[PDB]
Amino acid sequence: MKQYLELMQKVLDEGTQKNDRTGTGTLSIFGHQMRFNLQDGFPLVTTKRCHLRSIIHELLWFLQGDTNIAYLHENNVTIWDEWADENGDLGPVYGKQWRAWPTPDGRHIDQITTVLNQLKNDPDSRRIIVSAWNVGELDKMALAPCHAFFQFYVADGKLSCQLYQRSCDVFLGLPFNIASYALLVHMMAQQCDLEVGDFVWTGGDTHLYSNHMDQTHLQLSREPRPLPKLIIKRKPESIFDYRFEDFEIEGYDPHPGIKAP
Amino acid sequence: MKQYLELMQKVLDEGTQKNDRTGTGTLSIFGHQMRFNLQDGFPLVTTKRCHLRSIIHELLWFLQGDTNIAYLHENNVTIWDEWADENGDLGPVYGKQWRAWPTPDGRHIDQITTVLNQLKNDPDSRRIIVSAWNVGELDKMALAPCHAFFQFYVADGKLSCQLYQRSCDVFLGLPFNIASYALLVHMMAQQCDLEVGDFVWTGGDTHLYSNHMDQTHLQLSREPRPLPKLIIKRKPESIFDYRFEDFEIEGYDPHPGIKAPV
Ligand SMILES: O=C(O)CC[C@H](NC(=O)c1ccc(S(=O)(=O)N2CCC[C@@H]2C(=O)O)cc1)C(=O)O
Ligand SMILES: O=C(O)CC[C@H](NC(=O)c1ccc(S(=O)(=O)N2CCC[C@@H]2C(=O)O)cc1)C(=O)O
Numbered sequence: 001m002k003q004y005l006e007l008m009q010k011v012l013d014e015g016t017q018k019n020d021r022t023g024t025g026t027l028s029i030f031g032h033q034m035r036f037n038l039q040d041g042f043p044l045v046t047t048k049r050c051h052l053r054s055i056i057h058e059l060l061w062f063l064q065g066d067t068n069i070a071y072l073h074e075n076n077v078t079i080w081d082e083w084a085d086e087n088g089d090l091g092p093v094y095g096k097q098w099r100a101w102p103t104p105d106g107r108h109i110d111q112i113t114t115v116l117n118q119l120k121n122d123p124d125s126r127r128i129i130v131s132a133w134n135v136g137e138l139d140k141m142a143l144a145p146c147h148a149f150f151q152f153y154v155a156d157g158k159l160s161c162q163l164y165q166r167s168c169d170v171f172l173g174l175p176f177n178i179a180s181y182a183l184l185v186h187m188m189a190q191q192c193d194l195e196v197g198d199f200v201w202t203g204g205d206t207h208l209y210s211n212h213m214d215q216t217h218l219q220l221s222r223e224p225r226p227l228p229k230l231i232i233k234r235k236p237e238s239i240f241d242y243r244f245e246d247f248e249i250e251g252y253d254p255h256p257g258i259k260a261p
Numbered sequence: 262m263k264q265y266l267e268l269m270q271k272v273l274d275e276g277t278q279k280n281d282r283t284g285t286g287t288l289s290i291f292g293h294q295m296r297f298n299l300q301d302g303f304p305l306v307t308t309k310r311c312h313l314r315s316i317i318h319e320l321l322w323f324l325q326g327d328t329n330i331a332y333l334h335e336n337n338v339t340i341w342d343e344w345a346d347e348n349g350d351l352g353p354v355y356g357k358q359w360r361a362w363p364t365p366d367g368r369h370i371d372q373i374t375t376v377l378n379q380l381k382n383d384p385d386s387r388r389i390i391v392s393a394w395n396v397g398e399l400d401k402m403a404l405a406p407c408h409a410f411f412q413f414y415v416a417d418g419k420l421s422c423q424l425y426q427r428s429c430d431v432f433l434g435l436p437f438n439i440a441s442y443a444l445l446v447h448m449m450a451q452q453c454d455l456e457v458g459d460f461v462w463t464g465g466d467t468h469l470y471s472n473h474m475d476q477t478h479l480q481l482s483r484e485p486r487p488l489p490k491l492i493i494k495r496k497p498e499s500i501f502d503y504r505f506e507d508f509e510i511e512g513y514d515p516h517p518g519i520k521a522p523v
Contacts (some may be wrong), residue, residue, distance in 0.1 A: 032462065098491065104365055104367065111396060124281075126465070154290065160291050198292065200292030204414070
């Protein structure tokens with residue numbers, strides 16, 4: 001996508017060499033922002049074929065508050081396999097904080113239900129937020145949240161969302177993360193009778209791993225294609241009732257998938 | 262400052278006319294990002310006189326974990342007065358979350374100390390973060406955090422920081438918030454023997470209140486002066502041991518103050 005390819009080029013040109021916790025290098029930058037007007041098309045990278053199937057199952061899994069990979073396993077989505085313990089558990093990662101953030105008195109807070117009620121009853125609210133950054137639960141997680149904090153906003157009947165991503169793997173994670181939040185905006189907009197607005201992406205530590213450099217060079221030699229259009233085929237009773245078969249992507253004409261280690 | 266006036270101009274050119282929680286109208290945009298290279302000078306707005314005195318006292322108060330206005334009130338800082346209850350309490354706002362976020366199992370996490378240690382021992386960490394957004398306690402607070410989430414980054418011996426401000430009062434709040442975090446970057450850099458890098462400001466709901474519009478256009482008719490300079494005169498034993506008198510600003514020559522209604 002244009003913005004996505006300018007970000008890759010900027011990391012290559014301006015990133016500083018760093019050594020992560022695995023001893024693998026990265027070129028990284030700090031602080032970046034991109035804006036996707038969702039009325040211009042669904043923001044699925046076209047410079048490499050992305051597989052929406054895994055993006056869709058992961059988001060649905062998030063919304064159910066499940067942190068066990070079984071459901072992902074049942075549908076052949078393997079992106080979380082390496083973090084899962086012997087029982088397939090991840091600890092209280094994304095989903096559990098979105099649906100049941102634990103409070104000290106033993107209660108739980110459902111941020112998604114709060115957000116839907118804020119969108120329907122107080123759309124101008126300046127605090128329509130979901131945070132996965134539960135400081136007191138970080139040590140229990142297989143991984144601290146990367147896409148960690150998001151906010152919704154309503155103007156002229158359009159629903160926008162901004163994500164603060166504290167850590168971004170530009171080649172492998174980003175394409176997935178942008179599509180995931182664009183997807184969520186379409187679903188929330190539908191449940192709230194709103195049109196779609198902008199998806200604003202903000203990055204903190206934004207990096208390209210050293211073993212993604214051939215792939216990055218290959219991807220940057222390709223020209224982006226017009227964005228596809230997302231179709232929701234059925235409007236469920238609630239934001240927790242979507243199914244994989246409800247989504248269709250039309251006009252998606254990507255360059256070939258690019259594998260990365 | 263150039264970045265600040267450009268943001269004012271962006272809110273005026275693109276903003277959507279809305280109504281704040283109290284009705285008082287707002288002009289707002291959603292999503293914005295700007296950067297201040299702290300070696301260029303301390304980012305204290307020059308197009309209106311700002312008092313750094315209040316900004317300094319508030320930051321030392323945050324760093325102590327204090328949520329009562331007594332300290333501020335004693336030092337003639339009244340910016341939090343309208344939110345305090347009859348005993349001066351604000352609930353577990355900013356400072357409490359920064360220094361003692363309560364976990365489900367009964368522990369408390371001191372996020373400032375955690376960040377200080379991560380900067381000294383693992384400066385390339387990608388999770389050098391402080392969050393004031395404690396979902397479980399937001400409704401006990403007198404106000405939910407505006408400057409809600411921030412992250413540190415280290416490159417070429419310089420310390421940078423990015424703030425996610427979910428709600429921004431551009432005219433009244435912003436000048437204070439920018440100087441506040443820039444001061445905090447200086448203090449942390451001093452404690453870990455680093456140089457200052459950039460302060461990255463990101464906005465969520467970024468608005469100008471309708472009764473700040475003439476003050477905003479008055480400010481927009483002025484030219485930004487050269488940035489002042491920050492001189493810290495001592496190196497305390499910890500990030501929690503700074504004193505008001507340890508900070509001096511030099512070369513601050515602003516245009517005249519502009520009062521406005523909160
Ligand atoms: O689509 C598929 O089935 C997977 C194909 C493969 N994707 C990835 O490895 C991939 C995709 C997303 C991610 S992620 O950043 O959203 N993410 C989810 C798993 C943990 C990880 C994180 O935060 O570190 C991490 C890795 C790719 O080449 O895109
Ligand atoms: O010096 C003084 O007493 C303040 C005078 C005045 N400043 C402001 O009103 C001002 C300063 C800071 C803020 S703030 O956004 O940082 N903030 C701190 C008080 C509660 C408020 C909030 O979260 O809503 C909000 C307003 C100014 O002209 O800068």
